[PDB]
Design a protein around this nucleic acid. Structure first.
Ligand SMILES: [Mn+2]
Ligand SMILES: [Mn+2]
Ligand SMILES: [Mn+2]
Lengths: 135, 129
DNA sequence: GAATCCCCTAGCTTTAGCTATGGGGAGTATGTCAA
DNA sequence: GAATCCCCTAGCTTTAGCTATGGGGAGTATGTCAA
């Protein structure tokens, strides 16, 4: 992980060659510090199952009590929202079934929002000038 | 500095370096065809709330750096930019219509980019732990 | 082979000509070779 | 105010609880304050 190359390695679906990495962040309802202990270990396991099913590659994932950071490699045609929607939605249903305190003390496990930031190997300014200098 | 945008439910910054080429990689993206291609895409971007950070053509392919709402989808912008530009350019420059079955191909190249490079973003996550 | 060539459906915009984590295929053809 | 709180429809997955370039709102209440 610490020595994982950040150099691009493209992949493709039937019509698109791509490399789309997203930094996704979301928090529990009311920003409660519920992602600890067992809840945390299960959350990551669940999201990993979702990733495998959705052909999404979790490059990095760390939970930190009242929020979670994921760095995912997703097919842009598939849609980062499909991954997020499934990871959050399934993790909610399951974690709330497995951990009664999350079902009784919160109307929902997550909020309706999330933070999404795309990332690449190169910084935005490098790409911008590269495009700018096409001719 | 990164200016994050937001729809009703998502705070975001999704920037993509999009590239596609004319059918048979013909070097038709020049002159008036090139100028119109850029205008049409600008129109589409404004209508689709897509910010076009940078956009340059190079005879047989077009590069676009755009910020697109994740929920909306990058493929929707790409579909609209290619589909519409094909329809309009083919009506405006008859040769694009007579010598090619389509203006574009079914493929494209897409890569994400952020203000911060991957190593820095990994470092932040690592550090906040 | 595939992104790129040929062919297909279904869904949508541009009602033509493009997507879909969409499918099938080969041989100088109505036909490409790489950003 | 908003992403985050409250409220709503409706689309899809997990059939509950998340979305949608989705919409409406205000003030201790079922009720948050930032990664
Ligand atoms: Mn195909
Ligand atoms: Mn809302
Ligand atoms: Mn180029």
């Amino acid at each position: 992980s610490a020595m994982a190359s950040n150099a691009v390695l493209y992949k493709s679906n039937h019509n698109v060659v791509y490399s789309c990495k997203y930094h996704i962040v979301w928090c529990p309802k009311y920003r409660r510090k519920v992602l600890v202990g067992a809840v945390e270990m299960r959350l990551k396991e669940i999201i990993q199952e979702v990733a495998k099913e959705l052909r999404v590659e979790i490059i990095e994932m760390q939970t930190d009590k009242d929020h979670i950071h994921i760095l995912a490699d997703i097919d842009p045609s598939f849609g980062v929202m499909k991954f997020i929607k499934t990871a959050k939605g399934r993790s909610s249903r399951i974690l709330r079934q497995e951990f009664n305190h999350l079902k009784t003390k919160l109307p929902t496990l997550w909020t309706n929002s999330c933070f999404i930031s795309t990332v690449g190997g190169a910084p935005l300014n490098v790409v911008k000038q590269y495009i700018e200098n096409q001719q």
